[model samples]
Target: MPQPKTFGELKNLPLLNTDKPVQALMKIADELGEIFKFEAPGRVTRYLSSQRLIKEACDESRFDKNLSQALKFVRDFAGDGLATSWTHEKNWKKAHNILLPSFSQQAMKGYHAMMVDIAVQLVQKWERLNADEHIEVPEDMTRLTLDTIGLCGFNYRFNSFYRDQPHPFITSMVRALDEAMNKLQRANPDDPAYDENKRQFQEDIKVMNDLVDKIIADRKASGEQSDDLLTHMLNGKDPETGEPLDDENIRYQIITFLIAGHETTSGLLSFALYFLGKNPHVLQKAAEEAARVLVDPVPSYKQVKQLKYVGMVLNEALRLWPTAPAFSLYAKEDTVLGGEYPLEKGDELSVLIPQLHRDKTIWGDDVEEFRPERFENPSAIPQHAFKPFGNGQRACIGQQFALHEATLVLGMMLKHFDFEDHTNYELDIKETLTLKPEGFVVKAKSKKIPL
Candidate 1:
């Protein structure tokens, strides 16, 4: 019954950091080995940072989604929306089958025009800024993504570009999501002041529900149902059992698309832009490729597929920084991870994505470098070695959407502007429910306007 090396003082472990957990975890993983464990009163949480352990643990029959921590909080607000729901839930399957077609290759065409609309809004918003103004890269990327999800997922629009402030849905959603992350790392729940936190948490959840209901109500009443997720939910039936997603269930799925779909892609765009800003040579190559292919402002789907260099940069960025960061899983029964450590039923383990991606053995010694060319022949790499989107059936259903939207937006921007990091800010990742570079700034100067 060999076990993982248990470390004392959980406080010092990299995963314990309230705000900067990703960096701490990576450093600790380097200091330690492939897998390590931390013991608590009733739980043993092991961290897998190597592909060998991670790939072994990914066996679906032996392990399943834990759906705890960040996703638990999301479930609290969104109520079993596809990404946040447990694998055992019937909604997970029905929604999966029903929405499968909605997110398909053919389905994306309906979404492409809508995606172009939001990307243009982003381009024009930055285009209108003065030369000296420092562009807050993350927020606009967020605006670009949230609006894109709203329009493309359903027919709703956040209209994020029109206002200096985020929509009320976004405002409330952020507060709720931020608090959820804060509670995990640091929080005094019993403090009298904490009630205010709880109170706003309640109010914020209500606000999200209200906004989603409004979106659903508007679409439900609109004269004819159009091609989109909501319609799929209303009309599409279970392949196993013929019934549409209940009206109440549709609301949560709508909210889920807004939350899950938007957050993931925004981080991708933010990091990809930051990586390009930091690496002038890579930026120039990607920009030149985008210019040559995306001669039009809104690239055609065929043109988006031709963004080979830009796509490689995205794969490279995911290796450096996985936006969703990590996902949790637990043993289904007595099991051994990597054939040495023993695990009882329901023991929790999570893959430290940053560390796993940086596994030097698999990615080579230059794993830290932002070299998109490594992705030139993605299949040439080991399977499950690069999962910025997560793993197996539970992987992000929005994978194609995220990649397509990011490639299009990046191509559109790179064609028009060259991103420069004026202050030479070093890379720093801030942990929330997801990951993003803190205090990242760039100047998107005019390059070449597309016809």
Candidate 2:
């Protein structure tokens, strides 16, 4: 069958109708080359997949703003918080500056103990499940990460690890994210179900907001303070305005951290383990590195950084499957991307990260293959070619925080248990707000005590 030229036709393609629409999009982008034009509603949208164009799109002057309607609904729940405030550079700049120091290297050290504790709890649960028991990797990772965020981000404990059913926050937050993505994908306002989806989206946001409000109330009543993210926000004053942030803004920031901190790292850990289980040789090397650096069950900030092979495995995993596959940048003024596509002011370009990551031109013929060695040799790949965390000033603030948490959790999991892929796993990916491994499971046994 011939491929569709316009975005509307591609949207109706049988290939994209499957579970992996982003993958299908990448395949189409690959065939179409650097710049592909498509019509979505009244406007013609250009998808940029080349590394050069993607990097250029990262430039703040050319493409700093995001798709306005892409996440506008989040403001209904989170007000004008970090995720939704990016379009307004002045407001975003103020918030980013205030929140920047909290996620710094020194500040991250404060959360290390809580991160390790939550990971150890996960290890205990898996150990109790015993040998040959199937573990739903993504679900469990979600709980683990959720619990971690509750403790580290807000000094609240969802106790997600303690229960079989997810915490209310976890469940509602998941629903909200899923629904938001659904709205974005449909993009058809005239559809009959759009109102229903919007209604559900609002309700989901309410559930999440109520929970956050409860936590904030509890903190206020107690009058006890800790050096966590919650504390930073409560006491944090805007640089321009000398007053503390409003209650609404604080709630929005909390929601942003909970969703971003929990979901992205959850997917990262799952993908890293998925790759390791598939490649036993790589797993062995990673385990050996983990053993050497993480001599104890928990790792220190300095110690976890030395797990070289583990880091390589993570980098490779992200390259293969970036959790947030595509991010958009709106042209502030008329500019040419890659000296090829002319973008007008207010035009939004979707920079396809997955396609850029797999580009054979930049990454060579084996780009499709999962090999961690590409990351080991620094000069083997271009710096901008691998951008799982994203690029430029608008990049994720929690990048280092995530890397630290992932290294600690992954290293600890490897040291204690051996994940076996007994199912002959094929990557069944699902695309929503983020890319996640669907139907991915693994079995675990004590490395020291074999069945």
Model 1 pairs whose backbones collide: none
| lDDT (CA) per prediction | 0.81, 0.78
lDDT of 2 by residue, 1-451 (tens): 1235433444433444456778887877868787676454444456777787777877776778584454675556656777777656555666777789998877878888898878888888888895547899998888888888888878878888778778777777878777665555564566786777777777888888888888787887888788678888777877876657666677888998877777688899999998887788898899999878876545788888788888888888889888978777788999876665666898877778888887777888988788989888867777578778766777888888888888888988888887777888898887766777888998888766211
Q: How well does candidate 2 match the true structure, expressed as C-alpha RMSD?
A: 3.0
User: Tens digits of per-residue lDDT for model 1 on 217-298?
Assistant: 7877874587567777877888987778887789888888877877678888889988887788998899889878987647
Error of 1 at 419 (Å): 2.2
Q: Kindly provide the TM-score of model 2 when superposed on the true structure, using C-alpha atoms.
A: 0.92
Candidate 1 Cα deviation (angstroms), residue 441? 1.6
Candidate 2 residue 51 C-alpha distance from true site, Å: 1.3
